[PDB]
Subunit: 211 residues, 6 copies
């Protein structure tokens, strides 16, 4: 990544073994549960496009998903090239060239070029741009791998209200990577109590009532 040193200047630092291992392990343990995306964003803080590719490429499983991600990336890269065309021909000697989509995605750009863009004044934040494309792709994957419709999250006859609401908001989070449906999907006993509370009741108030 690119970080500020002790002196106060933006320099490249090697991606740490701790960062590499943390990402690989989150994917192994959590697959594409929604919370994997904020972990990715945090572990890739200050990442160059090279670092972002490293993180994605170190994943061994889920290769269908990783192929789907590459498709989203290529779509975003094509849209970048449409909005920001780069003049062809020979570059001015010793001057910074403009990044194409594939340069932002780290496939046709060198690390030195990536560092040049990211530390320029004004900076072309190719790492942040690429990360946005990756997260767009990861959001689609999270939605794809969401196992259950929110319509099928219903409280069991003996299921505690707290456990039901946890499943409900867990599913909501996965499905769109509400209080009315929550009441509708509650069990008969709890539903009667929730209907008595009236409109505008907070989740906190609903929990206390069915507890």
């Amino acid at each position: 990544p690119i970080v500020q040193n002790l002196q106060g200047q933006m320099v490249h630092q090697c991606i740490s073994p701790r960062t590499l291992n943390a990402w690989v392990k989150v994917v192994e343990e959590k697959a594409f549960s929604p919370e994997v995306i904020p972990m990715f964003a945090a572990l890739s803080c200050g990442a160059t496009p090279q670092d972002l590719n490293t993180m994605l490429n170190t994943v061994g499983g889920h290769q269908a998903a990783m192929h789907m991600l590459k498709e989203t990336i290529n779509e975003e890269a094509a849209e970048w090239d449409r909005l920001h065309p780069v003049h062809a021909g020979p570059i001015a000697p010793g001057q910074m060239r403009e990044p194409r989509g594939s340069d932002i995605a780290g496939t046709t750009s060198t690390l030195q070029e990536q560092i040049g863009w990211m530390t320029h004044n004004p900076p072309i934040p190719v790492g942040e741009i690429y990360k946005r494309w990756i997260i767009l792709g990861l959001n689609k994957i999270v939605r794809m791998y969401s196992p259950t419709s929110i319509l099928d999250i219903r409280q069991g006859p003996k299921e505690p209200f707290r456990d039901y609401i946890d499943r409900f908001y867990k599913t909501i989070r996965a499905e769109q990577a509400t209080e009315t449906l929550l009441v509708q999907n509650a069990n008969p006993d709890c539903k009667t109590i929730l209907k008595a509370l009236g409109p505008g009741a907070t989740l906190e108030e609903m929990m206390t009532a069915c507890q």
Copy 2:
């Protein structure tokens, strides 16, 4: 977070894999036991609002609680906007804008803006303000998930006094996120001894007597 470098100046640093993992694991292991809140406060030392959202969003379980937390945050954010209205219109070129509630909560503000506010002179400590709102919300959750009333913590016939008092003060801590009720809830044998000690007896003295 924002930290002082070796030279002695406030700069942004990436949230560490160690910090990220520590928070995720405390929540997995302890849920919303009261001691999770001081751990949160310590792990989020110097946090920007972005860092605070990262920590909250990396939590995979307890999504009902996380939804309740967002409600508390929005309430605090609305109260901020009532007390500190921001003038609408175009901002002065190259000048620092005033933070709204949603800027403090990191939903409508960029990292650069957050850094600007937190390192300004005088600083607008948006991280500390947001953390206060989050902890208010976490305290409510701790109280909500407290399993037992202090009224139902009573010493068993064969339960050692030390074990009973541990349950008692554990419950007290959870319920409000005393010595009289402690005596009242003690078993017959211990109660007789504690009544003999008289008023103004310390917990230390009570323990020695029923030991």
Copy 3:
């Protein structure tokens, strides 16, 4: 805590996840065995009162003990206020105020104030003062939770001398958070041998003889 940077100046640093976890784990694994106190002192090197409260508050179990500790702290804080009264009224604009007992204990003081006192010239070492009060309290807890009187540590007929002396000095350490009683509590066979050695014999010499 407060540490010296690379340049050579006292600055605040965030308490580390490693430090937080180490303390929590020692308490989980060792409870209030005597060796927990030197570990606490070492893990809290350079701690501010805020850091010390963090460490104490992150402990989830042993809440009776933690309540007893707060009592000892309040007693020490009251004694501080008796010896060092602070003049009431409005403070001089932009000047350092004098710490009361509750400021030293971190309940009525801010981190900024704590840093100000600890890095002042001359420094008011509020962290070291508070740590002394905490350790006084922890020593009482260690003595309280000591399971056995030294009078009841006696060598078994078949117990190796080395194992007996380990229990003996372990108990001595817990009870007051000697050679004569050691001999008196030895088994008949070993006692006869130890009596033959005469007075002024070192522990080393006693071990060799009953080995």
Copy 4:
């Protein structure tokens, strides 16, 4: 490796125990699955040829593969010597000599020489050149140890489509260290559905249809 210090200058740093252990463990856990190569590239960021040899030589198993790797390295080294012949005879006193293939591979060059080349202006990036040769060799090994032809990846009668596509793209990755064959190798039920979708369908769309 060679890194930029706090002051902003390229200096040698010892390879870390964390890096050494991470590499050894990835090889133990993953053998030569394709994702081992990006992990190698990331763990060897800024590596000198000495560091690269250390990483390769610390591997205890897979010695057939390691011998095959040495062969690829020697081939690349010979091609380097053909393209870049070095003038024989005595070197100019106190001057930098030109690297031969075996110098780039770290077998006939000292660490000091490697540092000299890598930090020269312009730099001769012997670490990056060597790493390219190593990765060429590792790619061959990955292909060699690929257990299955893509022709033999076929969807089972009861195998979920998601599981089949994961095996498919996993095998594709190993074999060349597509959508048509994916459809051809699908089971009868899924194949009928995929044929109905028509040409130009994305993987995402195919998954939704057979889900």
Copy 5:
């Protein structure tokens, strides 16, 4: 400990959680096997007397040994006071006092005083002096806890020579915290072979012969 910072100056640093845990764990895992002493010396690199006491005091078991160690320390401290008497009376205002035995052992000296002595010019290396006393004491403990005389290390009829020699030199190391006795204690078959080799044979040569 006292370390050199980045700028190049001797300053105090807090003992690390990693160091504290490493020492505690070595003692738990290895007790007083001979190799524990070089680990102690290495983990206490640059230690102040306070750090050395921390390390010793964090040990929970082996309290007989720890009491024996204190005796050795007090003996060394008394010998220091005999060789280096300190003038009594009031110290010169703002001047460095001379360390007594108990100051070197960290019982009557403050950290500030210890730092003053260790960073003085010329330095009074109180940490190194104390560590020498501690290691003298640890050596005695290692010898004390050595379970077997070298006279009782004899090769079994079916014991491989390599296994026998490992036990032999392991015991030698513990007992004094040779080739002739090694041959004498070998089994009949190996002994005959070793006698044929003649005098001046290396251990390497003896191993090859009985292998």
Copy 6:
């Protein structure tokens, strides 16, 4: 070890707990498999002779081997003294003395002297010289503890070729701390195939053929 600080100057640093533990664990897990030597070399990067002795002395097992190592070291030290005799008598006040063999091996030299030699201009690299002697000794130990002759590595009737070649090159590595013998030791079926390939066939080509 001796490292370059942030400012860019050679200074002593304490050996890390991570380094100490890594070495101890590699020896426990791998004994004297050949790959232990490059791990030793890497873990001892920049080591002083004191550090090298620490690493060797922290090993608890394999004391026969450690005694054999000391013999190799003493032989190398004697050869050093023969090639580089040091003038006897009193040293020039405040001047650097010349290292003898035992000074290079860290038995008669202080850390300060070792640092002086290693950071001198020109430097006397006593750490690198000693490490060379240690590795010479470790190579002998690796060869000694090699369990099998390469003559006894033969492919089983049902053993996959890949597994056989792994054993073969593993043994080759241990025995000398080839393609013809590989073919000769292959099983009848594979041998026939390998004989058909003809001379000059690479290992890669042989693997493909018997796969």
